[PDB]
Design an enzyme around this catalytic site. Structure first.
Site, PDB file in Angstrom:
ATOM      1  N   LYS A  73       0.795  -1.229   0.000  1.00 39.84           N
ATOM      2  CA  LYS A  73       0.000   0.000   0.000  1.00 39.84           C
ATOM      3  C   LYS A  73       0.821   1.270   0.000  1.00 39.84           C
ATOM      4  O   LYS A  73       0.409   2.297  -0.561  1.00 39.84           O
ATOM      5  CB  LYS A  73      -0.944  -0.003   1.201  1.00 39.84           C
ATOM      6  CG  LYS A  73      -1.737  -1.318   1.387  1.00 39.84           C
ATOM      7  CD  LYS A  73      -2.929  -1.476   0.435  1.00 39.84           C
ATOM      8  CE  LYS A  73      -4.227  -1.609   1.257  1.00 39.84           C
ATOM      9  NZ  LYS A  73      -5.460  -1.520   0.427  1.00 39.84           N
ATOM     10  N   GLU A  95      -8.630   9.453   4.246  1.00 41.80           N
ATOM     11  CA  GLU A  95      -9.559   8.900   5.074  1.00 41.80           C
ATOM     12  C   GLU A  95      -9.130   7.470   5.099  1.00 41.80           C
ATOM     13  O   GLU A  95      -8.428   6.942   4.171  1.00 41.80           O
ATOM     14  CB  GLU A  95     -10.955   8.987   4.457  1.00 41.80           C
ATOM     15  CG  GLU A  95     -11.221   7.972   3.299  1.00 41.80           C
ATOM     16  CD  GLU A  95     -10.765   8.478   1.898  1.00 41.80           C
ATOM     17  OE1 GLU A  95     -10.953   9.697   1.564  1.00 41.80           O
ATOM     18  OE2 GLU A  95     -10.219   7.647   1.123  1.00 41.80           O
ATOM     19  N   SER A 302       2.195 -12.502 -11.086  1.00 44.33           N
ATOM     20  CA  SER A 302       1.387 -11.437 -10.586  1.00 44.33           C
ATOM     21  C   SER A 302       0.158 -12.086  -9.962  1.00 44.33           C
ATOM     22  O   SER A 302      -0.197 -13.230 -10.278  1.00 44.33           O
ATOM     23  CB  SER A 302       0.990 -10.602 -11.769  1.00 44.33           C
ATOM     24  OG  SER A 302       0.448 -11.473 -12.752  1.00 44.33           O
TER      25      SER A 302
END
Lengths: 316, 315
Positions: A73, A95, A302
């Site tokens: 992330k 957020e 992947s």
């Protein structure tokens, strides 16, 4: 779905990112900054035990599967924070529900040195004091938003309210599934880093550019992201494997062929691929039996090791 | 607790391992085997925002913290599996509870070409159904033990019986919680791979061996294993930091550590274990003391977590 009020603000970011796409410099700079920081560059592994099932070609698996709890992330986020920094922004918002994106956002901001504020739902706040803890440890003002529902949506809004006000100094950092994905090309581009890293690794590990770089095409961008850095390498074939059941060359791979590669990879190297990766593998082995001894092939692995274990186990 | 029937088989592995310990052959073979495979070599990261705070020395972080919770089970299992193959064993067995040790063990066997058998409680087999499927996708055979009351305890006991009967070609892989740990030296030594990695990585990234390599000594073998490879590099200082053979020990106080903690989060966005934070504090003084351009390699051992609370309270 998105306030109209977001339009000039989103238009600003796109136009600013359009200037970055002129050169490799943005991307190059991201790649520098993230080197050894959280997972990047993902490893390039020579699967020596597949060799015998691929005409004795050398199969190198670009290991996008070695990502889990963390690595992931920060990659999106750091791209964004870098862009915010080059837009002369000084401050960043986001957020988060449970808090994972706020922690990544807070991480990218300490790293790049940018104030940062994160919007958390009121009852979301008091049921993970910990990520909050991380976020405040990271130096980020946590605004615990009381106003209505208490469950993310109200935070999205303040976050939105914030961004319009402050747009001259503030960048909005996107990444929650429940939030807006306003900049899809910017996301695609961040994926080209896979090929950028794999082009350095294969020449260092293999001593030259590969005969072929291969990806399953239903992984979308991120499976396809490995190709971009090899476009101007005329000797390198680029082959996208299409799932079939029953400049880029496209070729079909059936369920059976994917399945058999899935199991061979588990048995030869002990790695449990996504069914997606197993198609690219199944094509990599056909391609090595085509190309013969001395060939060098790079495979984008992947997708997620876990996911398909169930389906594979049924199948067999 | 451990059957006495096991003494000869444990004695053969220790004897053979002690003969590997003689040279770096065994470890260079592990290093090569596991490169790019499941996390190793952990990255070496130059923490350039910290330099301001360290006499303008260069601080490099050996990113043990980027381990998965999990990264460590294959690392130990690959070591034992490579030793079984180097001893001439063709086959590796283990017991597992919820399946993790079994999956790790089968993954190492598939990699190295070895036959694998895992003994699971008949019941454990039913509940941990996808760990079982992973194992068999891996090519391992999975024995749902029918003996006793089909328990983990019963699994271990069948695995001990197979070990003893097949010891000529069969190695037993340790590391479940309910199982024994007959080889602590072996496990401590595996940690030597940390400094072997970092010795290669510091010369590519910095262009030369460092001025010091540093670790927090309460962190056990996982901490102290960075040192070994630089022992014969006279010119590299070796410093162990403790919470206040050629290694130097120095004390680091709680508040030196917590200031290093907040500094790392804030300059690098890395949240350390408190344990890493002591070594990071020590590395900040030592750069002040060696000065500009000094290359200091720090072991960031322990896990950036559960210290989170404790760090929050403090601040």
């Amino acid at each position: 779905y998105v306030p109209e009020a977001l339009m000039a603000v989103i238009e600003e970011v796109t136009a600013a990112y359009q200037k970055e796409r002129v050169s490799q410099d943005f991307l190059d700079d991201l790649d520098r900054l993230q080197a050894n920081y959280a997972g990047r560059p993902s490893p390039l592994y020579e699967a020596t035990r597949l060799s015998q099932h691929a005409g004795s070609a050398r199969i190198f698996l670009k290991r996008e599967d070695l990502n889990h709890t963390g690595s992931h992330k920060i990659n999106n986020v750091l791209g964004q924070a870098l862009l915010a920094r080059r837009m002369g922004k000084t401050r960043v918002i986001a957020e988060t529900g449970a808090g994972q994106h706020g922690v990544a956002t807070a991480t990218a901001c300490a790293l790049l040195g940018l104030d940062c504020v994160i919007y958390m739902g009121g009852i979301d706040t008091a049921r993970q004091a910990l990520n909050v803890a991380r976020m405040r440890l990271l130096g980020a003002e946590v605004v615990a938003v009381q106003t209505g529902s208490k469950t993310l949506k109200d935070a999205i809004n303040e976050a939105f309210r914030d961004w319009v006000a402050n747009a001259d100094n503030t960048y909005y950092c996107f990444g929650t599934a429940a939030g807006p994905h306003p900049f899809p090309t910017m996301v695609r581009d961040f994926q080209r880093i896979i090929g950028m890293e794999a082009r350095v690794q294969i020449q260092g590990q293999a001593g030259r550019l590969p005969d072929a770089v291969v990806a399953c095409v239903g992984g979308g961008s991120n499976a396809i992201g490995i190709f971009h850095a090899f476009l101007d390498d005329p000797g390198v074939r680029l082959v996208g494997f299409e799932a079939a059941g029953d400049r880029v060359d496209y070729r079909p791979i059936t369920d059976s062929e994917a399945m058999d590669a899935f199991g061979l990879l588990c048995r030869m190297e002990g790695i449990i691929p996504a069914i997606e990766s197993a198609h690219a593998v199944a094509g990599a082995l056909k391609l090595g039996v085509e190309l013969g001894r001395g060939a060098v092939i790079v495979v984008n692995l992947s997708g997620r090791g876990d996911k398909d274990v169930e389906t594979a186990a049924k199948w067999f």
